[PDB]
Design a protein around this ligand. Structure first.
Ligand SMILES: *[C@@H]1O[C@H](CO)[C@@H](O[C@@H]2O[C@H](CO)[C@@H](O)[C@H](O)[C@H]2NC(C)=O)[C@H](O)[C@H]1NC(C)=O
Ligand SMILES: *[C@@H]1O[C@H](CO)[C@@H](O[C@@H]2O[C@H](CO)[C@@H](O)[C@H](O)[C@H]2NC(C)=O)[C@H](O)[C@H]1NC(C)=O
Ligand SMILES: *[C@@H]1O[C@H](CO)[C@@H](O[C@@H]2O[C@H](CO)[C@@H](O)[C@H](O)[C@H]2NC(C)=O)[C@H](O)[C@H]1NC(C)=O
Ligand SMILES: *[C@@H]1O[C@H](CO)[C@@H](O[C@@H]2O[C@H](CO)[C@@H](O)[C@H](O)[C@H]2NC(C)=O)[C@H](O)[C@H]1NC(C)=O
Ligand SMILES: *[C@@H]1O[C@H](CO)[C@@H](O[C@@H]2O[C@H](CO)[C@@H](O)[C@H](O)[C@H]2NC(C)=O)[C@H](O)[C@H]1NC(C)=O
Ligand code: NAG
Ligand code: NAG
Ligand code: NAG
Ligand code: NAG
Ligand code: NAG
Lengths: 193, 249, 254, 50, 100
């Protein structure tokens, strides 16, 4: 590469996994109480009864049908594993960002092989073959072409970063509302109640 | 205002009794919180960094645009008056063209970056308008949208190029540990809380609201009965007192 | 570049090789006829991790993507034997590595970050660890409460600036204007975009603040059950009629 | 090449500034999305969730 | 070079405009989900007043929402008390307000 460096992320994947583990343990063992203040423990059945009350069904229905609900939840979460493992292209949204960034970087690299009207695309070759007074004419064309390509790359990256920020804000709002609480907004947290 | 606060307490799931029996403490806590906010704003600096960053970015971009006007761009000089003063038009045009191209490119870059920044600011302003509608003109159940805790009410304050929201929230404190059961069995029937949770202090059983400890005797009024004792997992045995019998006697 | 004994095999008729975009990765010398590979020698950026000129003048230098084994704009004190720490984001010189770990100020990368106690570098701490006493017949219920007031700052608008395309490029030159006229209508589009931004700036403020049908006014006798809104409410003494908090906010930002 | 490039002003200062802004923004996005817990809660060793 | 610069400017402007159009489309989809398929408690999200229901209508390049809301009218003055005393006990409304 030619001046192309990649900066490692500040939060390593182990830390992000630890954060998700903290989120998930807190929501299992406390419900939504850990979001508001200190984590208050609750039996998981009673939390489910509270959430049934939240969606409009009396907590009677949970206790009369606890085993069936547990079996249905286990079957659904197993089907999640089966769908993820067997079926492909489920993560196309995540793959699109990687593909777009790689393609932009590749075209930025490949724009270094264009003459841009000069006698060659190799600057050292121009220097070695030509005297200084005439070399500047070709070098200026090379400078113009490479500056324009770099400016185009930077503009596209800014426009893409704006969309990534919008998606990150949506993900943060969904983490705050779907995970740390129970939402009454229709279709915000999955489909159904 | 006290009745409004009682309504908001009902909104967050706490009985309005609690406000009326703790009105003085609640008023003192609110006043102290306002005083702390004033002290932190007066003493601590860089708190308003989000407002300052926009101004700094705009000023830096404008300064760069102005300073880009002093570049040769391959011409003999960066001053048009000097070029016109000492050159004939046929050769002066070649020098002027390079300056024109460079300045046009710099201005285009400035305008594009300004458009991107304007889009970001518009998104921020839309978020601020939504918060004004849903946190100030009403009470919101959305988690962490109007502060951390259980939202009560918010107050808007104007800023030089923005808006400042003071979110008042209810935060539980001083928790205690109890023993709980899902249902109470009486006369071979399963009793559930109408609104609350069954708790035990070691020897007796009571009913409390879920966000504040107010133990009460289990009665028919604050419970409902449905089904036998076999189906429910975790039942415990206790008596459910009915107020009708003592008055009937 | 730096030459190395290549492992890949050449057919008896090539002379060199490349991978993507004429990047010559291999070559054979014209005399020994041995296949060699070419890779560029290491390069990267340089960062300074000062805690501020105010407080101390000590700094830490980070070389990004550079192995510690080989390093030597002289930087005399930084290439003679000082304590050198190697991270996943590069090599760190001038900051000692502490076995402890806690919340930090200045990020570095890959979970490593630095702060001023001397300057130390350590693994970032996500937070405190507590194990909630979960059981199938135990509950925690609050017995008291506290009321919290927090501040959220959101920018709504920026300064309305207008740049004249013709006067910026030319600045009172008829010849320059005549030459620029041949370029089409770039100036018109630029001015239109700037004016659109300027109008959007006022639209943002109108959307945010103008949400009251009428100008409601507070009663003179202020009896709100004990709640005191004196600081939040406007102060008639001030000419601008701003409140205490608003006055403080306006003073801070300049 | 660099001496000739110096005649174009501070374009590349702007380019590097924009890229660094994007790089900082990515870390800010991740931190806002995931870091929402005061404490690192741990699940009990005994899994009895009904 | 002149024509290519003009084309690049046009494409950049189109991208910037399409971003705003996408934001508006996301808002419209959220409004449809939260007001046509349900009833929302969010203030001033679907009309002004207390939301009841909404009806979508198609437009050449957009959507029109007809928001039906409940607006109180013809208010009257009364007198209130936080609680009422009887037999040395304090009484509070279950779901209403004390008026005189
Ligand atoms: C009531 O709950 C409290 C939790 O607030 C218990 O105290 C902790 O219990 C856990 C149980 O795993 C222990 O690991 C901790 O060490 C305890 N903390 C302290 C400070 O001792 C308490 O034991 C519970 N008591 C009853 C009777 O249920
Ligand atoms: C659990 O609560 C019950 C009821 O509050 C307590 O029983 C009463 O305790 C009071 C002391 O405050 C005595 O004066 C009464 O004689 C008790 N019996 C009644 C009212 O029938 C009980 O002591 C509590 N157990 C604890 C705290 O371990
Ligand atoms: C609550 O009380 C009922 C009856 O008072 C208990 O039911 C008895 O359970 C035992 C358990 O071995 C049986 O042998 C009896 O035949 C049941 N009936 C009677 C009349 O004693 C019930 O077990 C009690 N609840 C708990 C949790 O022990
Ligand atoms: C609930 O908390 C408040 C404070 O957060 C307690 O009020 C304090 O009580 C102590 C002890 O009597 C006094 O020294 C303080 O002056 C009080 N502060 C205020 C602001 O009034 C209150 O007692 C707590 N209530 C319960 C039931 O624990
Ligand atoms: C509301 O708070 C303000 C500010 O603390 C109170 O005004 C203060 O009153 C004390 C005593 O009269 C004076 O010593 C301070 O100088 C006042 N400060 C300011 C900024 O005026 C005000 O009294 C409080 N409201 C009520 C009803 O007590
Ligand atoms: C709760 O767990 C204990 C084991 O610690 C067990 O003996 C008891 O039967 C359980 N009760 C319920 C209702 O699950
Ligand atoms: C060049 O000559 C040297 C000795 O003079 C010999 O070792 C080498 O193999 C020769 N290489 C070629 C390509 O002829
Ligand atoms: C700045 O200097 C003041 C005193 O001159 C000192 O109190 C303060 O801590 C310093 N702050 C920093 C960030 O160095
Ligand atoms: C630096 O080079 C040494 C020598 O081979 C190697 O062992 C070490 O792993 C290298 N450092 C990194 C970070 O790869
Ligand atoms: C209530 O009384 C006040 C004062 O007498 C008056 O200003 C107000 O208009 C009255 N409200 C209604 C709805 O009549």
């Amino acid at each position: 590469f030619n001046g192309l460096t990649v900066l490692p992320p500040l939060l390593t994947d182990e830390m992000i996994a630890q954060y998700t583990s903290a989120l998930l343990a807190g929501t299992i063992t406390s419900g939504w109480t850990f979001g508001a203040g200190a984590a208050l423990q609750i039996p998981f059945a009673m939390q489910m009864a509270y959430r049934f009350n939240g969606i409009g069904v009396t907590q009677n229905v949970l206790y009369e049908n606890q085993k069936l609900i547990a079996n249905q939840f286990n079957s659904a979460i197993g089907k999640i594993q089966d769908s993820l493992s067997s079926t492909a292209s489920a993560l196309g949204k995540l793959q699109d960002v990687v593909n777009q960034n790689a393609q932009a970087l590749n075209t930025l690299v490949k724009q270094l092989s264009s003459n841009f009207g000069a006698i060659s695309s190799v600057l050292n070759d121009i220097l070695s073959r030509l005297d200084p007074p005439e070399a500047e004419v070709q070098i200026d064309r090379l400078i113009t072409g490479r500056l324009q390509s770099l400016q185009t790359y930077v503009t596209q990256q800014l426009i893409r970063a704006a969309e990534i920020r919008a998606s990150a804000n949506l993900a943060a709002t969904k983490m705050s509302e779907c995970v740390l609480g129970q939402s009454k907004r229709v279709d915000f947290c999955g489909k159904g109640y | 205002f006290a009745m409004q606060m009682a309504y908001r307490f009902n909104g967050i799931g706490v009985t309005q009794n609690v406000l009326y029996e703790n009105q003085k403490l609640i008023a003192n806590q609110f006043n102290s919180a306002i005083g702390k906010i004033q002290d932190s704003l007066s003493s601590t600096a860089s708190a308003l960094g989000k407002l300052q960053d926009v101004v700094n970015q705009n000023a830096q971009a404008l300064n760069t645009l102005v300073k880009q006007l002093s570049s040769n761009f391959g011409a003999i000089s960066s001053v048009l008056n000097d070029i016109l003063s000492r050159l004939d038009p046929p050769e002066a045009e070649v020098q002027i063209d390079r300056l024109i191209t460079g300045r046009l490119q710099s201005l285009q870059t400035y305008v594009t970056q300004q458009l991107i920044r304007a889009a970001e600011i518009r998104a921020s302003a839309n978020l601020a308008a939504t918060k004004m509608s849903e946190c100030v003109l009403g009470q919101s159940k959305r988690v962490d949208f109007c502060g951390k805790g259980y939202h009560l009410m918010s107050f808007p304050q104007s800023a030089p190029h923005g808006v400042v929201f003071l979110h008042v929230t209810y935060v539980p404190a001083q928790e205690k540990n109890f023993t709980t059961a899902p249902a109470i069995c009486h006369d071979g029937k399963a009793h559930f809380p109408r609104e609350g949770v069954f708790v035990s202090n070691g020897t007796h059983w009571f009913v409390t609201q879920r966000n504040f400890y107010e133990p009460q005797i289990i009665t028919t009024d604050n419970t409902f009965v449905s089904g036998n004792c076999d189906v429910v997992i975790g039942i415990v045995n206790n008596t459910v007192y009915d107020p009708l019998q003592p008055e009937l006697d | 570049g730096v030459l190395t004994e290549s492992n890949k095999k050449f057919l008896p008729f090539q002379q060199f090789g490349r991978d993507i975009a004429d990047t010559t990765d291999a070559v054979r010398d014209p005399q020994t006829l041995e296949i060699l590979d070419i890779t560029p020698c290491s390069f990267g950026g340089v960062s300074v991790i000062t805690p501020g000129t105010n407080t101390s003048n000590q700094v830490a230098v980070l070389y990004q993507g550079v192995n510690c084994t080989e390093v030597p704009p002289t930087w005399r004190v930084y290439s003679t034997g000082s304590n050198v720490f190697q991270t996943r984001a590069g090599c760190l010189i001038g900051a000692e590595h502490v076995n402890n770990s806690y919340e930090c100020d200045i990020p570095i990368g890959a979970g490593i970050c630095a702060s001023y106690q001397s300057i130390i570098a350590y693994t970032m701490s996500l937070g405190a660890e507590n194990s909630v006493a979960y059981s199938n017949n135990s509950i925690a219920i609050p017995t008291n409460f506290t009321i919290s007031v927090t501040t959220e700052i959101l920018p709504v608008s920026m300064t309305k600036t207008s740049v004249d395309c013709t006067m910026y490029i030319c600045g009172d030159s008829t010849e320059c204007s005549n030459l620029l006229l041949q370029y089409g209508s770039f100036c018109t589009q630029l001015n239109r975009a700037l004016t659109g931004i300027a109008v959007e700036q006022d639209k943002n403020t109108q959307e945010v603040f103008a949400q009251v049908k009428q100008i409601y006014k507070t009663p003179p006798i202020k009896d709100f059950g004990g709640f005191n809104f004196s600081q939040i409410l406007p102060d008639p003494s001030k000419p601008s009629k701003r409140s205490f908090i608003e006055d403080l906010l306006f003073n801070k930002v300049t």
